[PDB]
Structure 1
Amino acid sequence: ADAQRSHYTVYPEKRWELYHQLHSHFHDQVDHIIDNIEADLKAEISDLLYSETTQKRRCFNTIFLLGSDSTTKIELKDESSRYNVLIELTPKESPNVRMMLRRSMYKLYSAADAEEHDVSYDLSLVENFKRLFGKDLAMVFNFKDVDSINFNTLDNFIILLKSAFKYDHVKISLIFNINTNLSNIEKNLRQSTIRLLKRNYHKLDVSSNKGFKYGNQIFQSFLDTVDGKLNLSDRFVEFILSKMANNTNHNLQLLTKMLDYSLMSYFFQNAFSVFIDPVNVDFLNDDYLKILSRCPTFMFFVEGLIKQHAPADEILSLLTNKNRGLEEFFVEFLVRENPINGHAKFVARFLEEELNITNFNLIELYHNLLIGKLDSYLDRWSACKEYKDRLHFEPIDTIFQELFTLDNRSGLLTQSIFPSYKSNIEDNLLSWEQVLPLSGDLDKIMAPVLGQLFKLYREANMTINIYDFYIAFRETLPKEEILNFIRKDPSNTKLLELAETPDAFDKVALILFMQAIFAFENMGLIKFQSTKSYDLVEKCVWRG
């Protein structure tokens, strides 16, 4: 009723608590690491912004922050008897030379009155700032996304700032937050201005992924938060190797996402999650005792039991013939610490400072541990050759770990996080039987509306004719069902006069065809080439 008006508002667990004591505790380790790099980035700009006393003293100091994410915020020193202001210029606010000047002079001016306790918004204020506001000026220019701007505007901008170098009560500082590709930037500008730039340049790198000093760190703080109460399987962690390698800019926010979603999967379906604290042994039930039986390492050890002990009268008794000894057989292996966690923490600090190696990934270090490829892991520096015997660990085939583990053995978080998008749509439209289970008898003898043309839509050419496609569409519809369908309702009258018309079938097809190809434009599957002609269209969607 109201849906054509836009944005109308209206004003209409024993398991989960053990998640709640684990989740936030992990997240205290997350954000405390997040402010560490936040304090790191804010520090290394601040000292380098100051103490650089050049001899010519007629040049601005420039700073190239390579690899930076265009969101790096900056704080400034107080530095009394001089105001220090920050101006940010987003490529959305870069239309010309003119408004790049005019908005920027406006942005400092309100920042100037707020600290001060009619004028014109150009460089007139810059010289009279000594008289307009008393203390001197040191402005800084947070160019947020520098490679999207037309550089001749930027090149003409910096020559305008070059004229301000003759007043001696103002200091200029430029911050170039590039995304990447410093060699691209010295190509675009005028070479007369690069020689203006090259007085005191500083190529400080700011990257979230820099030698994995935080990537290996945040996975390490993940491991102790789940220490001894779970495991991480091999097929799980290689997914974390492969998919996180596909995102260069921000691994660290992504590793929080795919790990915490993985932990959300475990608490939501696994019944033995309650038993990670041994105080919860009183919650034991036969239904819990029944579902413990189908563990693969459980039944395999029983196959190991019979072949080792060909007397099986003991093994048959400890089966479901007893239940007290049966769970006592389980809680024998309950407290398995699995020191692969601790052995990782043993070797992680070692090569960090004993051999002092930094170009390493702790996750595949954990993964090569899971197969036994730690020997073929340390080889890539040939520096643990004196230490491959003391850092050695053979991964033991541990038992009952399949109840406390995380793995994408179901393809869940492969699907729900990285969905094969146009694959799952195209699979939905060719098949349609595994999505959908008086008038439903028609449905068992006639396809749904969107999908029935789709099989011929595959079987059509690159650019297709509209009418012959409908002519082919009329072939798929048999005649007797529609007149059985159009005459199904005796209650309505306005439909029934159309129902008795002898050309109703050929009219109801073009009505139904012009509801489906009407609905293949908002999906972008078919594009109407050369509007007001629309005799032929173009299909972009291919199967792959």
Structure 2
Amino acid sequence: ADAQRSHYTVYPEKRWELYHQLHSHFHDQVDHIIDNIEADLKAEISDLLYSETTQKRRCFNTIFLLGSDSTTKIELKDESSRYNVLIELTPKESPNVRMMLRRSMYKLYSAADAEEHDVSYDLSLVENFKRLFGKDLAMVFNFKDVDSINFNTLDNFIILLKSAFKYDHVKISLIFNINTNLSNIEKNLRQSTIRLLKRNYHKLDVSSNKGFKYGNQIFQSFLDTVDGKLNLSDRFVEFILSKMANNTNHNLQLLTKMLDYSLMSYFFQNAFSVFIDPVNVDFLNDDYLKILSRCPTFMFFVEGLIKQHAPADEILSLLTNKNRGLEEFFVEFLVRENPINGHAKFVARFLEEELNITNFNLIELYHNLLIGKLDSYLDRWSACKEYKDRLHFEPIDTIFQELFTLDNRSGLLTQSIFPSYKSNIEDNLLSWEQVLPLSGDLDKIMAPVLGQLFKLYREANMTINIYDFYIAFRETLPKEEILNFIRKDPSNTKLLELAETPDAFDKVALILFMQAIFAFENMGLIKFQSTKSYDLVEKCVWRG
């Protein structure tokens, strides 16, 4: 009723608590690491912004922050008897030379009155700032996304700032937050201005992924938060190797996402999650005792039991013939610490400072541990050759770990996080039987509306004719069902006069065809080439 008006508002667990004591505790380790790099980035700009006393003293100091994410915020020193202001210029606010000046002079001016306790918004204020506001000026220019701007505007901008170098009560500082590709930037500008730039440049790198000093760190703080109460399987962690390698800019926010979603999967379906604290042994039930039986390492050890002990009268008794000894057989292996966690923490600090190696990934270090490829892991520096015997660990085939583990053995978080998008749509439209289970008898003898043309839509050419496609569409519809369908309702009258018309079938097809190809434009599957002609269209969607 109201849906054509836009944005109308209206004003209409024993398991989960053990998640709640684990989740936030992990997240205290997350954000405390997040402010560490936040304090790191804010520090290394601040000292380098100051103490650089050049001899010519007629040049601005420039700073190239390579690899930076265009969101790096900056704080400034107080530095009394001089105001220090920050101006940010987003490529959305870069239309010309003119408004790049005019908005920027406006942005400092309100920042100037707020600390001060009619004028014109150009460089007139810059010289008279000594008289307009008393103390001197040191402005800084947070160019947020520098490679999207037309550089001749930027090149003409910096010559305008070059004229401000003759007043001696103002200091200029430029911050170039590039995304990447410093060699691209010295190509675009005028070479007369690069020689203006090259007085005191500083190529500080700011990257979230820099030698994995935080990537290996945040996975390490993940491991102790789940220490001894779970495991991480091999097929799980290689997914974390492969998919996180596909995102260069921000691994660290992504590793929080795919790990915490993985932990959300475990608490939501696994019944033995309650038993990670041994105080919960009183919650034991036969239904819990029944579902413990189908563990693969459980039944395999029983196959190991019979072949080792060909007397099986003991093994048959400890089966479901007893239940007290049966769970006592389980809680024998309950407290398995699995020191692969601790052995990782043993070797992680070692090569960090004993051999002092930094170009390493702790996750595949954990993964090569899971197969036994730690020997073929340390080889890539040839520096643990004196230490491959003391850092050695053979991964033991541990038992009952399949109840306390995380793995994408179901393809869940492969699907629900990285969905094969146009694959799952195209699979939905060719098949349609595994999505959908008086008038439903028609449905068992006639396809749904969107999908029935789709099989011929595959079987059509690159650019297709509209009418012959409908002519082919009329072939798929048999005649007797529609007149059985159009005459199904005796209650309505306005439909029934159309129902008795002898050309109703050929009219109801073009009505139904012009509801489906009407609905293949908002999906972008078919594009109407050369409007006001629309005799032929173009299909972009291919199967792959």
TM over 0.5: yes
TM-superposed CA distance for 1:310, in Å, is 0.0
SS of residue paired to 2:451: coil
**Structure 2 Cα separation of the partners of residues 269 and 487 of structure 1:** 50
**Structure 2 Cα separation of the partners of residues 539 and 216 of structure 1:** 46
TM-superposed CA distance for 1:25, in Å, is 0.0
TM-superposed CA distance for 1:85, in Å, is 0.0
**Structure 1 Cα separation of the partners of residues 95 and 184 of structure 2:** 22
**Structure 2 Cα separation of the partners of residues 296 and 505 of structure 1:** 60
TM-superposed CA distance for 1:403, in Å, is 0.0
Partner deviation per Cα, 1:370-396 (whole Å, 9 max, x = no partner): 000000000000000000000000000
TM-superposed CA distance for 1:106, in Å, is 0.0
Partner deviation per Cα, 1:105-139 (whole Å, 9 max, x = no partner): 00000000000000000000000000000000000
**Structure 2 Cα separation of the partners of residues 469 and 269 of structure 1:** 48
Structure-to-structure mapping, 1:266-305, within 5 angstroms: 266-305=266-305
Partner deviation per Cα, 1:303-323 (whole Å, 9 max, x = no partner): 000000000000000000000
TM-superposed CA distance for 1:270, in Å, is 0.0
SS of residue paired to 1:501: coil
**Structure 1 Cα separation of the partners of residues 185 and 391 of structure 2:** 46
Partner deviation per Cα, 1:283-308 (whole Å, 9 max, x = no partner): 00000000000000000000000000
Q: Partner residue of 1:505?
A: 505
Partner deviation per Cα, 1:408-450 (whole Å, 9 max, x = no partner): 0000000000000000000000000000000000000000000
Partner deviation per Cα, 1:13-61 (whole Å, 9 max, x = no partner): 0000000000000000000000000000000000000000000000000
Partner deviation per Cα, 1:134-161 (whole Å, 9 max, x = no partner): 0000000000000000000000000000
**Structure 2 Cα separation of the partners of residues 69 and 504 of structure 1:** 62
TM-superposed CA distance for 1:517, in Å, is 0.0
**Structure 2 Cα separation of the partners of residues 107 and 239 of structure 1:** 47
**Structure 2 Cα separation of the partners of residues 231 and 314 of structure 1:** 31
**Structure 1 Cα separation of the partners of residues 39 and 257 of structure 2:** 23
SS of residue paired to 1:477: coil
Q: Percent identity?
A: 100
1:367 aligns with 2:367: yes
Partner deviation per Cα, 1:215-251 (whole Å, 9 max, x = no partner): 0000000000000000000000000000000000000
Partner deviation per Cα, 1:41-100 (whole Å, 9 max, x = no partner): 000000000000000000000000000000000000000000000000000000000000
SS of residue paired to 2:172: strand
Q: Partner residue of 1:217?
A: 217
TM-superposed CA distance for 1:526, in Å, is 0.0
**Structure 1 Cα separation of the partners of residues 222 and 331 of structure 2:** 26
TM-superposed CA distance for 1:327, in Å, is 0.0
SS of residue paired to 1:62: strand
**Structure 1 Cα separation of the partners of residues 237 and 363 of structure 2:** 7
Segments of 5+ residues of structure 2 without an aligned counterpart are none
Q: CA RMSD in A?
A: 0.0
**Structure 2 Cα separation of the partners of residues 434 and 214 of structure 1:** 44
SS of residue paired to 2:174: strand
Q: Partner residue of 1:38?
A: 38
**Structure 2 Cα separation of the partners of residues 524 and 424 of structure 1:** 16
**Structure 1 Cα separation of the partners of residues 26 and 121 of structure 2:** 50
Q: Partner residue of 1:158?
A: 158
**Structure 2 Cα separation of the partners of residues 369 and 322 of structure 1:** 38
Aligned residues: 544
SS of residue paired to 2:258: helix
**Structure 2 Cα separation of the partners of residues 462 and 538 of structure 1:** 7
**Structure 1 Cα separation of the partners of residues 385 and 59 of structure 2:** 52
**Structure 2 Cα separation of the partners of residues 88 and 481 of structure 1:** 67
TM-superposed CA distance for 1:176, in Å, is 0.0
TM-superposed CA distance for 1:180, in Å, is 0.0
SS of residue paired to 2:40: helix
Q: Please give the TM-score of this superposition, normalised by the length of structure 1.
A: 1.00
SS of residue paired to 1:172: strand
**Structure 1 Cα separation of the partners of residues 437 and 289 of structure 2:** 36
**Structure 2 Cα separation of the partners of residues 339 and 532 of structure 1:** 72
Structure-to-structure mapping, 1:71-220, within 5 angstroms: 71-220=71-220
Segments of 5+ residues of structure 1 without an aligned counterpart are none
**Structure 1 Cα separation of the partners of residues 419 and 189 of structure 2:** 41
**Structure 2 Cα separation of the partners of residues 236 and 87 of structure 1:** 46
SS of residue paired to 1:69: coil
**Structure 2 Cα separation of the partners of residues 532 and 270 of structure 1:** 59
SS of residue paired to 2:464: strand
TM-superposed CA distance for 1:461, in Å, is 0.0
Structure-to-structure mapping, 1:119-518, within 5 angstroms: 119-518=119-518
**Structure 1 Cα separation of the partners of residues 131 and 222 of structure 2:** 57
**Structure 2 Cα separation of the partners of residues 325 and 434 of structure 1:** 45
SS of residue paired to 1:86: strand
TM-superposed CA distance for 1:401, in Å, is 0.0
**Structure 1 Cα separation of the partners of residues 366 and 219 of structure 2:** 10
**Structure 2 Cα separation of the partners of residues 311 and 75 of structure 1:** 75
**Structure 1 Cα separation of the partners of residues 277 and 142 of structure 2:** 51
TM-superposed CA distance for 1:203, in Å, is 0.0
**Structure 1 Cα separation of the partners of residues 271 and 164 of structure 2:** 71
SS of residue paired to 1:538: strand
TM-superposed CA distance for 1:200, in Å, is 0.0
TM-superposed CA distance for 1:539, in Å, is 0.0
SS of residue paired to 2:125: helix
**Structure 2 Cα separation of the partners of residues 133 and 462 of structure 1:** 69
TM-superposed CA distance for 1:471, in Å, is 0.0
Partner deviation per Cα, 1:431-476 (whole Å, 9 max, x = no partner): 0000000000000000000000000000000000000000000000
Q: Please give the TM-score of this superposition, normalised by the length of structure 2.
A: 1.00
**Structure 2 Cα separation of the partners of residues 426 and 52 of structure 1:** 60
**Structure 1 Cα separation of the partners of residues 225 and 125 of structure 2:** 56
